[PDB]
Amino acid sequence: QVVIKVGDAILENNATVDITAFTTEDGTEEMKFKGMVINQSATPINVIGKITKQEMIGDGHFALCFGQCMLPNVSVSPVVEVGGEGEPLSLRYTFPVSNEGHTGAFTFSCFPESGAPGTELATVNINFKYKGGG
């Protein structure tokens, strides 16, 4: 009943989304994933969003926004009450400009307020493929 949407599409659970676009500012690159977490039930549900896996180049950092934009490298959102219109979700990955490519890789899951292991309601895997991905 809880899904992640990217662009116009509901993702299958555990989908993988590749982001290749980057913007440059002050010798630092930024790549961004954007989507929505949607609760398709008539009854609202309280969830927490977590980055459950993170793979970055050495001086990379990430920034999660879900309910609130969290500080750099903070992996857990606040509790958010989600319904049918959905809650925006974004993940920004920032890292040094390089002539060489690499892939930053993250997993985001939505959990019931509990946060109990194995209770994931929806999961997306996000690959930031910078300059070919390496």
Author numbering: 28 to 161
From the publication, what sentences describe this entry?
PorA is translocated to the cell surface without the T9SS translocation machinery and localized on the cell surface in both A-LPS bound diffuse form and 23-kDa CTD-containing form, and thus PorA is a novel type of T9SS CTD-containing protein. PorA is 246 amino acids in length and is composed of an N-terminal domain and CTD with an N-terminal signal sequence consisting of 27 residues. We found in this study that PorA impacts the PorXY-SigP signaling pathway that regulates expression of the T9SS in P. gingivalis. PorA is the first T9SS CTD-containing protein involved in gene regulation of the T9SS component proteins.
Initially, we tried to determine the structure of the 23-kDa CTD-containing PorA, but no crystal was obtained. Therefore, we determined the core region of PorA by limited proteolysis of purified PorA with trypsin. The 23-kDa CTD-containing PorA was digested into a fragment composed of Q28 to R171, and the C-terminal 75 residues, which corresponds to CTD, were degraded into small peptides. Thus, we purified and crystallized the trypsin-resistant fragment, termed PorA-N. The structure of PorA-N was determined at 1.3 Å resolution. The C-terminal 10 residues were invisible in the electron density map, and therefore, residues Q28-G161 were modeled. The crystal belongs to the space group C2 and contains a single PorA-N molecule in an asymmetric unit. The structure of PorA-N adopts an immunoglobulin-like fold composed of 10 β-strands. The structure of the N-terminal domain resembles the ligand binding domain of FimH. FimH is a tip protein of Type 1 pilus and binds to mannose. This structural similarity suggests that PorA-N may bind an unknown molecule.
